[model samples]
Target: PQITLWQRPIVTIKIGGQLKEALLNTGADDTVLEEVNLPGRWKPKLIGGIGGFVKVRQYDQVPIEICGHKVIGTVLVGPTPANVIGRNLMTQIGCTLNF
Candidate 1:
């Protein structure tokens, strides 16, 4: 028998200038960066969502390493209950999302 490796969308985001990791979730339509590992480049901006237009910042793409694999993506800095990996970065990787 042979073993096959599965690859899913995963990205690393920097929080407090430190390296943090999050798994990319295609279910989300917008880009979300984890507050714990929020990146520095995020510029304060307002975005509309289910709740309403919320004030947030958009961060520049940073180098992220995962499982020895690395990638650079645009990160959004904002208040999140927890780390959430959203779509903006996911589309960049050119992946197929299936439910």
Candidate 2:
């Protein structure tokens, strides 16, 4: 995700050795991926979205690849319609919201 203003920002990400596409959702405050087998431990967290509350597994220090750019950040594993990379990772990826 960069200084994109037109189409929805869809970028590729590699997590746990698998490459997948994700959306840089500025509307969300945290990152959430669907159906992942992340190693290590996680803290069960309850989060809110456009619909109702969702119970997710919060994983810390998760390393991710966004279009070849690498960064370690927080990640959530749960059931979602789409894989979303919130501002938490957006900011780290040098992505800015342009008005």
Candidate 3:
């Protein structure tokens, strides 16, 4: 079975162990944990990429389960509403996107 935005399963994730479900985005190259969702008192370091170092407000390692798979990642903080479930996990399990 193939999973595409129009036909794929959109799994809702919960951050901070709350009932609120974070938005799921598959368009990102990697999974991004935005700083806006981080708890107070946690300061994240700057993250560097080909575009240069980016300001990381805060980060947290969270366990996410989707599509019957579980993985851990260091989520960075940003102004977005939720974490991104991008190719970071999708490609690992031989999942392909068909348009």
Candidate 4:
């Protein structure tokens, strides 16, 4: 589906069987989720953005469903203002920006 570039593109996503809203952030390289209990051994990593750096638990091979499309990839759990669906997952879902 086509999304406008002037506003934040928010969409519904299912992660680990739970549904939540997330923003489609093409600028981000990896998806970031709000702190949630996930099963797996996660490695600690720091992410830097416009709001500086935040330490997060990096979980690999996380199953996520975005706009009805299923995808498995890296998901970073941290103190995010909102969940973000990055390019890695967006590409899988065929998300694109329109003028």
Report lDDT (Cα) of residue 12, candidate 3: 59
- What are the runs in model 1 whose C-alpha is more than 4 Å off? 1-23, 36-41
Report lDDT (CA) for all predictions.
0.57, 0.88, 0.53, 0.86
Return the candidate ranking by TM-score, descending.
2, 4, 1, 3
Q: What is the lDDT of residue 81 in candidate 4?
A: 81
Report the C-alpha lDDT of model 2 over 1-99, residue by residue, as the tens digit. 344558777888999899998988989899999978999999999988457778999999899999878999999999877899999998888877566
Ten contiguous residues minimizing lDDT sum, candidate 2: 1-10
Give the C-alpha miss distance for residue 26 in model 2, angstroms.
0.9
C-alpha positional error of residue 47 in candidate 4 after TM-score superposition, expressed in Å: 0.4
Give the C-alpha lDDT of model 2.
Answer: 0.88
Better of 2 and 4 by TM-score: 2
Q: Which regions of candidate 3 deviate over 4 angstroms?
A: 7-10, 19-27, 34-54, 58-61, 92-94
- Residue 70, model 1: lDDT of 51
Report residue 15 deviation for candidate 4 (angstroms).
0.4
lDDT of candidate 3 over 1-99, digit per residue (tens) = 454565445565555554333334456655555543455355556644556766655444555555455565555566444556567555653556565
- In order, what is each prediction's RMSD in angstroms? 5.2, 1.9, 4.9, 2.0
Candidate number achieving the greatest lDDT relative to the actual structure:
2
What overall lDDT, based on C-alpha atoms, would model 1 receive against the true structure?
A: 0.57
TM-score of 1: 0.58
Which candidate gets the maximum TM-score versus the true structure?
Answer: 2
